[PDB]
Structure formats: structure tokens, C-alpha cells
């Protein structure tokens, strides 16, 4: 993370699709280095649906510049999450903040 | 025994290969040239010194001649491979030969950034510095006192 920043790192990190953002709130049912399974809350439930969101993080995929694209989780089991909360950190991102 | 064996010792990087390379570059000038060769001093001959790394090490005093700064600039090295070319590299294109600009005769080798600052700091005087007013037998005594 930048020790001195401008406060726009969060917006740049979130708006770019490099980080995994929770679509619906809930709790982290199963966290793993490659996938995240989130048990959504009853408020955001859909009829006739079990209510689990599965995020498959992209691990070590080459970019257009022959660099490395990797996503690392930043949540633990049982940790409550809300809509818009980051679940994984993309390349050059630390806890949802841009880290070049 | 054969030149094929010569390449086979070369690319495997045997120990004696470094000694051979040091022997062959002892007095073999190399021409360093920057991409925009605006004037005559854009290409100059230098004596190679083998170093570890992937970057060419350039003498600071010639940088003003090359109009080169160390922020990503690249230089091209050419190897003369005839006796005549080595002779003209040593006698005509050598950096020591080029001291005056052919455009106007002004010198081309001047201290620019840190040498000037160091010499300026060294050659300065306070009024109450330590060891003021003593008499010294010579410059060696002054250096010893400073150290």
C-alpha cells in the first residue's frame, strides 16, 4: 500500500474489474486460495434459490503485456460481507487499494 | 581440435573462456554510439572493461559529448575487426583525442553535477571552523588533520 496517497486508490481498484466484489451480502461460507463460496443473507434471497455465490478467482493468467494476473483472497471463514465489499485483491491491489 | 569444439567450449562457458575473453579485449577498442548522432562526437572509441550485469557502464565526463542521461537511454557498441580500424579507433575516435568541439573549439569535457558540488564544498572557508589558524608543513598534514 502507498504510505502517502490521495484517497482515489479505492475508487480505481474497485471500478477496475481486477478485484472480486461481492454481488450480495452474507457470510463467507468457504474461503480458499482459488475459490470463494459466500452464503447470502435471507434479505437478499431469491425465490427457489439456495442462495450461494461462487467466485472463481483467476490465478496466474498472462496479461496483454506478458505480465501476471493473480487474485488473492482477503476474507476469512465466518466473516460477514456486504454488497460492494471486496473479496479478493487483484494485481497491484492491497486490501482494495491500488498498489503500483 | 576443431572450431566446432571451439563453439562447444564457448557457449558452455568454461572457466578458461573468461581468461581468453580478457586476453582478446585487452587493447581492442569498441565504438559506442547513441541513437541520435547529431554531430561527430556521437560515436567514440573506448577501451572495454569486463563487468557483471547487462548494462554498459559509461564514463560521466563523456556524457555531455553524447548528450546522454541515465534515465533509460540506450547505446550501441560496434567492434572493429581489422588492424586499420583498431588503429583509427585508438588514434582518431578515442575519447582522449576529442577534447575540443570541432564546431567552435570549446572544450567538451567539463564537470557537470556532482564533481562541481564536491569541489565547491571542499574549497570553501568558514570563520570559526575547527583547527583554524594553525600552521601546516604541507598538504599531506592538512589531509591527515582532516581525516
Amino acid at each position: 500500500k502507498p504510505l502517502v496517497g490521495t484517497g482515489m486508490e479505492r475508487a480505481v481498484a474497485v471500478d477496475s474489474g481486477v478485484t472480486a466484489v461481492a454481488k450480495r451480502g452474507g457470510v463467507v461460507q468457504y474461503v480458499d486460495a482459488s475459490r470463494i463460496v459466500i452464503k447470502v443473507n435471507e434479505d437478499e434471497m431469491y425465490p427457489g434459490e439456495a442462495g450461494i455465490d461462487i467466485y472463481n478467482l483467476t490465478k496466474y493468467t498472462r496479461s496483454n503485456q506478458n505480465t501476471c494476473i493473480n487474485q488473492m483472497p482477503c476474507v476469512s471463514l465466518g466473516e460477514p460481507v456486504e454488497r460492494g465489499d471486496v473479496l479478493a485483491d487483484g494485481p497491484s491491489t492491497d486490501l482494495g487499494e491500488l498498489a503500483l | 581440435t576443431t572450431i566446432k569444439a571451439a563453439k562447444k567450449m564457448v557457449e558452455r562457458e568454461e572457466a578458461v573462456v573468461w581468461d581468453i575473453l580478457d586476453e582478446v579485449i585487452r587493447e581492442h577498442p569498441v565504438l559506442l554510439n547513441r541513437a541520435p548522432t547529431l554531430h561527430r562526437l556521437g560515436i567514440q572509441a573506448f577501451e572495454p572493461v569486463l563487468i557483471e550485469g547487462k548494462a554498459i557502464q559509461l564514463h560521466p565526463l563523456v556524457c555531455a559529448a553524447y548528450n546522454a542521461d541515465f534515465d533509460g537511454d540506450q547505446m550501441a557498441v560496434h567492434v572493429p575487426l581489422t588492424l586499420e580500424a583498431q588503429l583509427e579507433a585508438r588514434a582518431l575516435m578515442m575519447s582522449t583525442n576529442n577534447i575540443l568541439s570541432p564546431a567552435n573549439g570549446e572544450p567538451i569535457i567539463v564537470p557537470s553535477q556532482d564533481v562541481v558540488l564536491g569541489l565547491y564544498y571542499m574549497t570553501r572557508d568558514c570563520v570559526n571552523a575547527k583547527g583554524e589558524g594553525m600552521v601546516l608543513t604541507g598538504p599531506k598534514e592538512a589531509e591527515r588533520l582532516y581525516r
Binding site: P2, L3, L100 | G53, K54, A55, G72
Partner: protein, 50 residues
């Protein structure tokens, strides 16, 4: 504000500390500016250029 934050951290307000030479060990004649800066590694690597 920067000076107040430095004072909170028990650091000199001028931002310059006294350094020592690694090789000879003698103290430098003047305080030097020591701090923390964000450095970036640009996509211009020497092994891709040599």
C-alpha cells in the same frame, strides 16, 4: 500538519537525520533527508533490452 505528525512520531521536525558512512564509519558533515517514498518499477527491464 506534516511537522505535527512527525512530532507525534518522536521524529525530527526538519525531516533530516544524521547518517553514517557504511564503509568508513565517519559521520556525514551535514544532516541528510531520510524518509519513505513510493517507488515504481517501470516495464523497461535491461534483460529485455540487452
Amino acid at each position: 500538519e506534516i511537522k505535527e505528525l512527525l512530532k507525534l512520531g518522536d521524529l525530527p521536525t526538519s525531516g533530516q537525520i544524521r547518517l553514517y558512512d557504511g564503509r568508513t564509519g565517519e559521520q556525514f558533515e551535514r544532516p541528510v533527508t531520510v524518509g519513505y517514498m513510493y517507488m515504481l518499477k517501470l516495464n523497461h527491464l535491461v534483460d529485455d533490452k540487452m
